Homo-oligomer: A and B are copies of this chain.
Amino acid sequence: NITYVPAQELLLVGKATTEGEYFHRVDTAKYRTMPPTVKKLFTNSAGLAISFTTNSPVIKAKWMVPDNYQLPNLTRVAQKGLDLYIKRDGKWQFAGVGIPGGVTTEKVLVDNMGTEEKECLLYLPLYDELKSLEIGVSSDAHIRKGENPFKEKIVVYGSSILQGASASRPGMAYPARLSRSSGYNFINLGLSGNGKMEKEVAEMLADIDADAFILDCIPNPSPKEITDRTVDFVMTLRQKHPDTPIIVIQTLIRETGNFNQKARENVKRQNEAIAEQVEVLRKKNVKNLYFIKEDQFLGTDHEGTVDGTHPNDLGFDRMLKKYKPAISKILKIKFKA
């Protein structure tokens, strides 16, 4: 005897605005001048989650994801699945996953939990569109809309790496890890293959009521694109946000460059190009602009990626150990030890 409630009756967490389709990251009808593939990517629920409370001993989910191609460098869980965390001892802790099948999946996420009150956070798919989601509990349990677990809006814009390639499951995307560690809302606006600093995307970002912008968008654009686009991108943000801190992060050093000398040189050039445009911005006296240089983000053993580019969870763990102190200093956000 399971009673299901639509996620629309609970609390959506991690979305920059309340606009557009419920499970989309951005209202792509409103922001229709963005590139078509960018708009498609913003239909993926990366970094979104549902907050609820229940005394049920079991939590099930019924969810629908279209039969889109499964990326070979991602688990199906990460792309199309769900990740459930439950608060215990003041910390969000792993409870279970929703292992996706086909278009409609119905799974037990966790059972045999007992019937104490539990605060829950269910992360949504990273690399696919969520068409529907219902949360199931025992018929004699209650399920109620949860509280917002995080504070503020820290907007993170960037590449496939940011979106979550190749975290093993949805809650392991790096902004989700940063949010749980700090209690601040790191919003995932990563765009696989497509974080190339288009002015129309800057225009959308500038409309967000952000407390900070983190621009981790160096992996995708060419050096020429970085040279041509960075200043206009940052100036578009500053038009609407004269003071909001902007943090620019260099690209990680792709492991593809370990032996591929062409890839190595391209990464070097990307990082030089952004360093040069930061100097241009500094000469324009852009206020509250910060630049995080690459500093062994994936460690030193070359093991931190699935494919040379996209971190695995070990690579992300290493990256977070560098990102956290840098972000903490700039934004005055404490991360839990």
Residues 46-81 of A at the B interface (beta carbon under 8 Å): 70, 72-77, 81
Q: Counting CB contacts under 8 A, is A303 at the interface?
A: yes
| The residue from B86, B260, B315 contacting A113, defined by CB atoms under 8 A apart | B260
Verify if A161 is at the interface (C-beta below 8 Å from B). no
Q: A261-B112, A303-B94 are in contact. Are A76 and B86 (CB under 8 A)?
A: no
In the bound complex, CA of A308 to CA of B73 (Å): 20
- Whether A94 lies near B166 (C-beta < 8 A) is no
A65 → chain B, closest Cβ, in Å? 12
The answer to whether residues A96 and B313 also contact, given A70-B76, A77-B72, A110-B259 and a CB cut-off of 8 A, is no
Quick check: is A100 within 8 A (CB to CB) of the other chain?
yes
Partner of A306, one of B73, B97, B301, B305: B97
What chain B residues lie within 8 Å of A261 (beta carbons)?
112-114
Is A307 touching B99 in the complex (CB atoms < 8 A)?
yes
- Whether the pair A172, B77 counts as a contact (CB closer than 8 A) is no
Across-interface contacts of A81 in B (CB, < 8 A)? 72
Known A70-B70, A259-B110, A303-B172; contact A75-B166, beta-carbon cutoff 8 A: yes
Q: Mark A75-101, 1 if CB is under 8 A from B, else 0.
A: 111000100001000000111110111
Any B CB within 8 A of the CB of A25: no
Once the chains are docked, how many angstroms separate the CA of A114 from the CA of B261? 8
Contact of A168 among B113, B258, B262, B306 (CB under 8 A): B306
A312 an interface residue at 8 Å Cβ cutoff? yes
Chain A: interface residue total (CB-CB under 8 A): 47
Residues of B within 8 A of A101 (CB): 72
Contacts of A73 in B (CB 8 A): 75-77, 99
In the bound complex, what is the Cα–Cα distance between A158 and B278 (angstroms)? 53
Contact A94 B302 (CB under 8 A): yes
Q: How far is the CA of A332 from the CA of B70 in the complex (A)?
A: 44
Check: A263 CB closer than 8 A to any chain B CB. Answer: yes
Are B169 and A307 closer than 8 Å at their CB atoms?
A: yes
Whether A96 lies near B306 (C-beta < 8 A) is no
Binding site for B on A (CB under 8 A): 70, 72-77, 81, 86, 93-97, 99-101, 110-114, 166, 168-169, 172, 255-256, 258-263, 301-303, 305-308, 312-317
Given contacts A72-B99, A111-B260, A313-B313, list 9 more A-B pairs with CB under 8 A.
A70-B76, A72-B76, A75-B306, A96-B256, A96-B260, A97-B308, A99-B307, A312-B313, A312-B314
A–B complex contacts, Cβ < 8 Å, 21 sampled: A72-B76, A72-B81, A73-B77, A75-B306, A77-B306, A77-B307, A93-B301, A93-B302, A94-B258, A94-B303, A94-B305, A94-B308, A95-B258, A96-B260, A97-B307, A111-B262, A112-B261, A166-B168, A169-B312, A303-B313, A314-B316
Which 7 A-B pairs rank lowest in CB-CB distance, beginning with the nearest?
A72-B76, A112-B262, A168-B312, A313-B314, A168-B306, A94-B302, A312-B313
